[PDB]
Ligand binder design. Structure first.
Ligand SMILES: Cc1cc(CCCCCCCOc2ccc(C3=NCCO3)cc2)on1
Ligand SMILES: Cc1cc(CCCCCCCOc2ccc(C3=NCCO3)cc2)on1
Lengths: 245, 296, 48, 97, 245, 296, 245, 50
């Protein structure tokens, strides 16, 4: 009664028989905005089931050389579903997330992925190598949306910070000999009650292979990693026309 | 009368579930007597890091321990203890001959990300709320004290930024200014937590404008206005050449600190302010290195 | 933005064009903080 | 309430009084745009003519809802329906009604 | 205290100083679906303010020869706003409406419009004139959406029914000497608790000039008619991807 | 604990506001004594049709009236009174020689929109719920009664529709069939309110499929499956030529009627079933016409 | 019961059937001087009805080009009536005022006047255009008395102040489509209990056309504006001979 | 025309939520606004001059 689990939101149900418990970011369940924490005076929308549900956004292929990937969040779910709509139509957005990363293999494969949530995940550049040039990461790199983006210098998380310490963040590991999925529930984290789903990404999801994938030849070589996630307590306000970015 | 699913519908629960509680911890935890344990079914030592939680194994479960009454204080590890230490965050030059700041006045954009020591400490957290004590140490480049009168002026964003030593803005009718001689002890003043956000943000993963976000504008990524507190202007009070080359060092001591969401400590040399850029060709290891894992 | 919902209608014998005046203020929940100096204005030749 | 110079266009020193009010006249089409302006009060623009905008210059930050009353000064005989719209942040100046 | 009125839903407020009271279709305010009137077991979305608000859909020009127009309803609001989205994304839709038709002129103009709500407004054809050909009205005529559609034989409402009797339907008149707008509140009317906003149009809105518009030359000749409407108690269920039709 | 706007939020109110109540009205309203009234401020006669409501002016306000105790019943104006009257809705031919239905059997699509009298009455309302009594009057085209045995069989949609006089479907193992001689009084049977909708729909402004809705398919506009109750099949029971030409008339009497949303009574001649099409070139006035408004 | 009104002081009664309520300057009715607010020890005169009454001082013609006019107050009523006398004979004067500005037209004319009370209305000069010359407004401009004076740069109220903000002063508008008169009651406002009606003008009355007067040709082109006003609680002290200025 | 500011509330123009505004109005008092030293005079006492 701990390695098996079932997550159900809206009209979606995830199943798993080799889980490793559930992490609750900074020990706090997603909640709605207090009546004294808020400022925006207009009465918000809380679509509920039409937005708070599981969206299986993408699949990556784990290879013996993979460096690791990341997805910025608020963003990732735009353009997709009714959630995406309320996000374009409304100025203000607020919500928590249930992130379920899955990846399975056989008892004969081996490897370990680090799945973490890094709030305010600001990306950096190599500064032109020499570090004299003040370059800046493009809209394509900072906000890749679904499809995510691959890291180029995971050791420093492409931001000059040691990944070795990334675990001070709500994380969980996917060690093939042990489990086949990570589940992290993240509460709304920002210095404001609401913010724009468009120009601000409350956090990023990192999926990095710390112990490389390996297996003797002949075993299925296609080990995918799929990202499924669900907004929780989504609230929107500041209605206007639909804006893309 | 209602539809039920509306009556239960927990939508609109403003309070967070919690799951953890803050307990008193004035001293380090004491060690209690432990004895041998030879049994099945109970394995403290065994853990599953995958879960994402730190090993809760106690010393008592790994060895027969004595009893120790730990009375070591944990006071010096509080945020206030750790942060309420004045540190250099700004430096302003007011030379006689030069290209930097002649004319006799300067405008320092209030940004503490300019110096490595202080910057790294704060970049330990994602959000920080606090008041501060700013102290201004002025003198000549030789470190000599000179009979010169200065005027420091905090210029909130939106206020007229002085364009010359004799700018009308120095009337400082509503801005807070300070007049000090370099012969008087360094000026010190108390600043509150100004900012429309509930906390200053060391890292802002996003943009502030809502536009096209083309190449040229990638300069604005990570730029969060809730952190731009305005500028700090200084001038030698008068209408003629200073007569002495000056320098002002700005020290900041945080107080009444609250911090949130710890992050990994800075790994690579810093390159620019409000921009985590690192040197791609000089990516060094977090620390020292050996020759083999089987040798010290 | 101000748009014409229907149209400015008038009989014969009345001006085909008129004006609107806007008057603005703040609501009861309005407050300000951290006062500085107005930028807007700054004079020129020291007051005689 | 103070007069909001929505029509902050004229500058002839002879036509300065013209800024205090914008026109509305018998149109032909449908949903024609009358006037437009920023809601920002501490920003340069129309709000600068108001006492509110002026007092803002004296404070770095503000908070609260704003109101803008529009008084029609045409003839008693003239009728009409207008649509005034506030478009929250992120929404680009609406192209049509 | 009856010729002036203010309607406020969501973030929209309509004003009027020459109203003629408000009609409430078949004397019933829009309500949500009973727990025993429903069948669809999934928990619905009730976006509230993001959908229940005033949408000013279109303007027509009233001319001395105008025949009259109509708009089918459920449909008209698709493709427009967050309402339109929930309607494409969900199979099932349910809602009432507050319809405010406006048209003004001067005390020197004259004319009278009949504004009525005709439930299940099935359109017919002239049958090839001779009436021997079994023609059928096109998707363009049956479901014009916004922009509405002009009648060709108003006397029979393009359906072989006397308009003279159209008043047994929630209606209201716009008599220029008297008022400048019609307001009708319609409850959800169907033989099912929910239905598809796409293939079914619960009712049609008819705006027909019974007493022709007239005025001496020199008075503004452009008398428009604008249709503004707001969904009420909108409920959606049966979530899938977005379907247009 | 909650957010308030959630606590009031009347979203989820299943019951309708009403605004009107049904009162007893067994007889016509009586007239009460009226006297002259010469006063200001009170104007019964004056109305504002724009509102959309019928004049509520009473006879007593327009003339000095006597007293009348109206005991005239309103019973014959109920839906049941008005509708519970058998009427022709279907006609089926079973000739010997012909192109219509030889072979000795027919399949009548159950649709009451085929005859003008009955159709118009029901098209008075938009929705109707009711049970019905179907009576089948059979005989030869001359109206002659003949010693012939028939089998009527209700074939719900989805059931095998008979392809011949000897079709296996006539085993009618689960379908309800009726066996009658033309010499026996017309067969009559009782039918319930079958239909997945809560009421039959005379007008369905929409489509039933969800497709492209091109030209060819405009045939499906107004086609509501909740009204297609299946087919009614009939055959002369046997394996050889009937020997007599037959005709069956189907009469339907509605009972336990509920009706909703009245519509304008049909104005132009009917042309096709389930399709309001009218003759564009022969659009006649609702009624009679005169020569001048000032002459009878 | 708000668009009609009747003002009665002394032996004068003003009537109006298209009023727009009454403004009471800074929300305070004119009162007499407190026994502890005063200093002048001589017992004052309070002529009452002979001075507190309506004086209809002057008429101006509103034209499609009019810039606007102003009247300084204490002054305006000197030389006129018993009020004027007590003002010349006594050193000290004190009083409030009921100002009723009237101007009517037809339902076919249009325009809007701003009627405001600006306390201590100090006048300025254009400073010789270049602004290098320190000119000063003449006794004829600063204290015009009745007949008032026309503005030359209304935008700045001939004093370098935005008229756009003149409304922070007890004001009222005369919008022809709406009303035909302004009524403002002003209390005594000064930093002293009494002052000289001669050298000091407690406030000025501004009547400025913000929305120009307009009308199709053929309609009576002579639209006048008349100023009627009445002192309230007039008190005088410091009796000597009569002084003009 | 009346001369009074619109008393219309936010609640009457849109469906509003509930907000507990605890923002202070202290910094808007006359003393706050005015009790700030400012330059009002300048006096010269040169050696050589007029
Ligand atoms: C008198 C007087 C007082 C002063 C200076 C007052 C300075 C108050 C500074 C408060 C700074 O808070 C900060 C928060 C964030 C950052 C930041 N820099 C990079 C992004 O975050 C810098 C300062 O000048 N004159
Ligand atoms: C025994 C036995 C009984 C029968 C016949 C049973 C017929 C039951 C018919 C119920 C019909 O209800 C209707 C509702 C709507 C319409 C309709 N036609 C056009 C669209 O609406 C027709 C019939 O046959 N054998």
């Amino acid at each position: 009664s701990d390695r098996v689990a079932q997550l159900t939101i809206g009209n979606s149900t995830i199943t798993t028989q080799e889980a490793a418990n559930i992490i609750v970011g900074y020990g706090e369940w997603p909640s709605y905005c207090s009546d004294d924490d808020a400022t925006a005076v207009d009465k918000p929308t809380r679509p509920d089931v039409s937005v708070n549900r599981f969206y299986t956004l993408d699949t990556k292929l784990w290879e013996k050389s993979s460096k690791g990937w990341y997805w910025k969040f608020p963003d990732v779910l735009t353009e997709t579903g009714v959630f995406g709509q309320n996000a374009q139509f409304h100025y203000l957005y607020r919500s928590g997330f249930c992130i379920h990363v899955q990846c399975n293999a056989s008892k004969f494969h081996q490897g370990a992925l680090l799945v973490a949530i890094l709030p305010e995940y600001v990306i950096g550049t190599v500064a032109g190598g020499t570090g004299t040039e003040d370059s800046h990461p493009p809209y394509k790199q900072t906000q890749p949306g679904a499809d995510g983006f691959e890291l180029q210098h995971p050791y420093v998380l492409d931001a000059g910070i040691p990944i070795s310490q990334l675990t001070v963040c709500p994380h969980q590991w996917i060690n093939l000999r042990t489990n086949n999925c990570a589940t992290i529930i993240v509460p709304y984290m920002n210095t404001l009650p609401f913010d724009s789903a468009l120009n601000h990404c409350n956090f990023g999801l990192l999926v990095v292979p710390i112990s490389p994938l390996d297996f003797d030849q002949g075993a299925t070589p296609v080990i995918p990693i799929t990202i499924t996630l669900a907004p929780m307590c989504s609230e929107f306000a500041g209605l206007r026309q639909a804006v893309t970015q | 009368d209602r539809v039920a699913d509306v009556i239960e519908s927990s939508i609109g629960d403003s309070v967070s579930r919690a799951l953890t509680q803050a307990l008193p911890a004035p001293t380090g935890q004491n060690t209690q007597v432990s004895s041998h344990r030879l049994d099945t079914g109970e394995v403290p030592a065994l853990q599953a890091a995958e879960i994402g939680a730190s090993s809760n194994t106690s010393d008592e479960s790994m060895i027969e321990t004595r009893c120790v009454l730990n009375s070591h204080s944990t006071a010096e590890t509080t945020l206030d203890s750790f942060f309420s230490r004045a540190g250099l965050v700004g430096e302003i030059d007011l030379p006689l001959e030069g290209t930097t700041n002649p004319n006799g006045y300067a405008n320092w954009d209030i940004d503490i990300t300019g110096y490595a020591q202080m910057r790294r400490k704060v970049e330990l957290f994602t959000y920080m709320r606090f008041d501060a004590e700013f102290t201004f140490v002025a003198c000549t480049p030789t470190g000599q004290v000179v009979p010169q009168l200065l005027q420091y002026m905090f210029v909130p964003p939106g206020a007229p930024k002085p364009e010359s030593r004799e700018s009308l803005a120095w009337q400082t009718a509503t801005n807070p200014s300070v007049f000090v001689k370099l012969t008087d002890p360094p000026a010190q003043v108390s600043v509150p937590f100004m900012s429309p956000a509930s906390a200053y943000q060391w890292f802002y993963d996003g943009y502030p404008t809502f536009g096209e976000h083309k190449q040229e504008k990638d300069l604005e990524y990570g730029a969060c206005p809730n952190n731009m507190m305005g500028t700090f202007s200084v001038r030698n009070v008068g209408s003629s050449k200073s007569k002495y080359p000056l320098v002002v060092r700005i020290y900041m001591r945080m107080k009444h600190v609250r911090a949130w969401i710890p992050r990994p400590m800075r790994n690579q040399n810093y390159l620019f302010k409000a921009n985590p850029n690192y040197a791609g060709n000089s990516i060094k290891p977090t620390g020292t290195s050996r020759t083999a894992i089987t040798t010290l | 933005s101000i748009w014409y919902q229907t149209n400015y209608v008038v009989p014969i014998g009345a001006p085909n064009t008129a004006y609107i005046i806007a008057l603005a203020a703040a609501q009861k929940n309005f407050t300000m903080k951290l006062c500085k100096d107005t930028s807007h204005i700054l004079q020129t030749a020291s007051i005689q | 309430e103070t007069i909001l110079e929505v029509n902050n266009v004229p500058t002839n020193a002879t036509s300065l009084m013209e800024r205090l009010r914008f026109p509305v006249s018998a149109q032909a089409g449908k949903g024609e745009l009358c006037a437009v302006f920023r809601a920002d009060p501490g920003r340069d623009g129309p709000w600068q003519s108001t006492m509110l905008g002026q007092l803002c210059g004296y404070y770095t930050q503000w908070s609260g809802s704003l109101e803008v009353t529009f008084m029609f000064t045409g003839s008693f005989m003239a009728t009409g329906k207008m649509l005034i719209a506030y478009t929250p942040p992120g929404g680009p100046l609406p192209k049509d009604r």
